[PDB]
Swiss-Prot record, chains A, C:
Residues of the full protein shown: 9 to 375 of 488
Free-text description of this protein's post-translational modifications in UniProt: S-nitrosylated by GAPDH. In neurons, S-nitrosylation at Cys-254 and Cys-266 does not affect enzyme activity, but induces HDAC2 release from chromatin. This in turn increases acetylation of histones surrounding neurotrophin-dependent gene promoters and promotes their transcription. In embryonic cortical neurons, S-Nitrosylation regulates dendritic growth and branching.
Source organism (scientific name): Homo sapiens (Human)
UniProt family annotation: Belongs to the histone deacetylase family. HD type 1 subfamily.
Taxonomic classification: Eukaryota, Metazoa, Chordata, Craniata, Vertebrata
Enzyme Commission code(s) on record: 3.5.1.98, 3.5.1.-
Activity control note: Inositol tetraphosphate (1D-myo-inositol 1,4,5,6-tetrakisphosphate) may act as an intermolecular glue between HDAC2 and N-Cor repressor complex components.
Annotated protein name in UniProt: Histone deacetylase 2
Cofactor comment: Binds 2 Ca(2+) ions per subunit.
Cross-link (Glycyl lysine isopeptide (Lys-Gly) (interchain with G-Cter in SUMO2)): 67
Residues annotated as binding Zn(2+): 169, 171, 257
Amino acid sequence: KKKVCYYYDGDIGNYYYGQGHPMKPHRIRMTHNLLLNYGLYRKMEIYRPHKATAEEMTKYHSDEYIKFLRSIRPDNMSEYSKQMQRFNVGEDCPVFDGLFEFCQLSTGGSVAGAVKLNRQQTDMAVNWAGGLHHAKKSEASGFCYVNDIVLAILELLKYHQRVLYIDIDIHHGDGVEEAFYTTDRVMTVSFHKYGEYFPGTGDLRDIGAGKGKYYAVNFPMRDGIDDESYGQIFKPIISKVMEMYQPSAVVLQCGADSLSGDRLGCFNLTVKGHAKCVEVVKTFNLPLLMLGGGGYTIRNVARCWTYETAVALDCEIPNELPYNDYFEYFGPDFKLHISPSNMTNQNTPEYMEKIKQRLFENLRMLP
Amino acid sequence: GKKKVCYYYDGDIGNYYYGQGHPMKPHRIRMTHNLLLNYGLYRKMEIYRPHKATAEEMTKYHSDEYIKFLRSIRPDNMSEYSKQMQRFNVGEDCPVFDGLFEFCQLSTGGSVAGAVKLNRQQTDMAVNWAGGLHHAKKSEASGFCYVNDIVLAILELLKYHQRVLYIDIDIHHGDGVEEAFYTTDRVMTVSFHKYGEYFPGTGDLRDIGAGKGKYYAVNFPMRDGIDDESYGQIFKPIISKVMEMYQPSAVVLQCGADSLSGDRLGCFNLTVKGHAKCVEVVKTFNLPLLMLGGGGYTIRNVARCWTYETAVALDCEIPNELPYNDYFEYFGPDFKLHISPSNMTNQNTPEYMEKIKQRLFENLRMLP
Amino acid sequence: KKKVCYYYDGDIGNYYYGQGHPMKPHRIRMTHNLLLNYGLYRKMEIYRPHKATAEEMTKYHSDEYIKFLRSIRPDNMSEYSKQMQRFNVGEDCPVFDGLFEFCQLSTGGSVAGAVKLNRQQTDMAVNWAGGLHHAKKSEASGFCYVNDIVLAILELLKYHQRVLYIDIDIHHGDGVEEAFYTTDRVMTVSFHKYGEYFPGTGDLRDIGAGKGKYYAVNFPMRDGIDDESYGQIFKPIISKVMEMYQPSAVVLQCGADSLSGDRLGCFNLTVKGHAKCVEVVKTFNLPLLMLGGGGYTIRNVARCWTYETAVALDCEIPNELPYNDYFEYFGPDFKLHISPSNMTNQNTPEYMEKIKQRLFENLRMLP
Ligand SMILES: [Ca+2]
Ligand SMILES: [Ca+2]
Ligand SMILES: [Ca+2]
Ligand SMILES: [Ca+2]
Ligand SMILES: [Ca+2]
Ligand SMILES: [Ca+2]
Ligand SMILES: [Zn+2]
Ligand SMILES: [Zn+2]
Ligand SMILES: [Zn+2]
């Protein structure tokens, strides 16, 4: 069947955002340990990504911002207060030990993955430490400092005329959208919570500009969407995008903060419902880069990305979790799949149908 | 909802003549007025005649020596003032004409009277199309402008308002206003203008203010041929962010019509609807607003533009079919209010516009 | 630090070859404006070239040809139809307004630079308006009218016994190679596309004649050479030449039509890979005259010669372009450095090594 390359650096789990910060890079090491215990390592090639250089990052980001990220340290923040304000670093995007190397490792895997797809050495590349969709050319945002997605897409664009980016993180992928907002060579499609919610962008009316008009697609949702409502909008929209846009490569950001029970998210998807998106994208048989993203209930991120790796591999894995280094975290059930909550779905059928119809109208405006 | 609008007009303004072949025609203000009367917009607004601003008023900004020269110089005594004419940059672009000082007094009186009415909360909006003379400097004429009514009106506003936002959509850089306020944070100046080998030569986006004023000057340099779509996609986002970060309590909008398609001196491609979208954007913030004229050299389009911007200020839909008026033949061959863009190339790519916007947003982050 | 002087005349960008003609002197004005906005003027001496006189030009070119260039105008062309034919002016080398002054300004910067180098007033001289390597003794060729390189080298040869000429334009530098083909006082080294390509000369087997046998070196290449491949043969070739020939002055023609994406060329070098050539030549610490040459995607010509000027000054400059008078021409990315394309490199590793080995054989035949 299909070949799968997978990127993991065993140091990624050691980076620490600071006491009380919801972002926990350990979740990637948990993910990896669970998947190795299911035996999915016998079925894919595992590579340690090279660290992305600062020069590689300045393909998109400004030199002064990258020089700042490379220079700032917890003990020198006082000498950089004007730069912190300029680049939005210090609060929600804190300065921690090893910040710059954390950026190099996350970016390294995404770019390596793109390179391996360009060379046709693989069908699918996976980098769960990637997916940092909020970072901007000269600004950190939303816990993200360097936009690994944009840099991987710039690499795909050397060999692919049209690239399709799909984003199922609960948040609008605003950094990626902004990077490509005036081009038709990248189509961005984001499903997200919208309305008094971070980052504030991703309105139905934001459809791109210039040559990029109609090549940005946003599906704004309210709280509580569930597996059935979501899957009934995802498949028809992505089907129509594939038909109208005909991309030659696809990048899928699989942020797990859209899962029921997420610490910061308000959606009601299960692991099966989230992974249904992966299965759908796979049926189009295009070179695929699968990336991580948000996810704050870390036992549920590990289950989500494990199951999505198995989907990538076309492997049915048992519901009963194998023994692993983090086994106790998954109690008291020790199952792979999760139950939705009883939260109210605030997306009415009329609302969902009205949005879908507008997006179909916009997709009909493509060449 | 709908605002009180006070409108300033002196029926004498149209008689001032810059001289043979000079492209500034104050007659365009009389055309604008006549067109708006004929659409019936006078029923909806209060029409006031500006006072003649005095030397006391003008020297709140300009030098006593400059304003004394302006009060003294005449076509008949020019030959005695050859030296001073050089010093104050009067005599070529900024000619000596009969009634020069009175034209300055009338232009200025409407802007300053409007600022007073706003300060007193007697109106939500004040309009002076004879104003907007943004190039004049503290001791020098420039770019057809002699007295900076804008700087004087902003000084009047600053008596009651801690922060004033100035927005300039004339095709030229609003350099006299920027220079006056370059070292203060109490006026933020935002100019969109053609930049590169074009008058007055200033307004690089790297000019951002200085001292307490650093970050409170915003310049958006553009190339030839900009059109409604391109302009409208950067103006609303920049103005929204400026409003968010600076939180002004009054606004002054210079609406120079030399940014329209077909302008004799300008090289942009905006329609009357594209230019007026700026007024509509600024209005949505519901702040006391002084709307001023500025350049504009194809006079039939100037009258169209300012008539429509008045109707916008009034929330009043006017028909595209122009009513009969005293200047009706100047609006041929179509006799419509709206204009079409030309086929000129837009040298401002959508990437260039987003890139400049992104660079100015980085500077707006530096506001406290 | 080695001293750099740089020549530019502000009128150069106004000369126009005519509608549809690919050579655009405006590229020189774009280059100048980018390096002014990078701040590099602070670090070099900038001079306006003199207009070279007919006396200077006839140090090489025939009196009759220079007299014709001085005379010919769009409004008297009808009267000169036979001379146009004889001197090959009027087609790919059009008659245009101010032709002769264009020639004078380009030549004046190269000869003036060589005079500064001979007087030991500078270590490096740069003239991006120069590098017109196809012009012949009595005829125009390849958009070139007056061979400023040959005249500069004749200036250098007043003070220097041996001068090395290196040419990294994609075309063989035939006018220079021909001028010196029978002398050992100039060694000419050209790397160029060869095989049914302009100007048709520059075979590996063309090695000089008479006293100049072995003092012409040609490295013929195929489409798609990349930075990796070019740099692996340029350094060893140039090092061996320097060891065996021991020049006391170097002239480097930096034609940018060897860059990826050129409108007329077929190579895949980036600005970094092209500028590595300048870095290598600089390590020998010889008086160096750096000249322009072809280049037809003018945004990338401006990037390349700006970055090469920075290299001459030993100054790294940021990838983020500064605002400048032509900033819109550098979209969509507004970065200094460019990416290679996915074009196939037709130069195999074995081909490169085999040709390298053949040239190393010829080089071993020097004293
Ligand atoms: Ca999303
Ligand atoms: Ca797009
Ligand atoms: Ca302006
Ligand atoms: Ca200011
Ligand atoms: Ca060559
Ligand atoms: Ca020789
Ligand atoms: Zn998220
Ligand atoms: Zn103007
Ligand atoms: Zn060439």
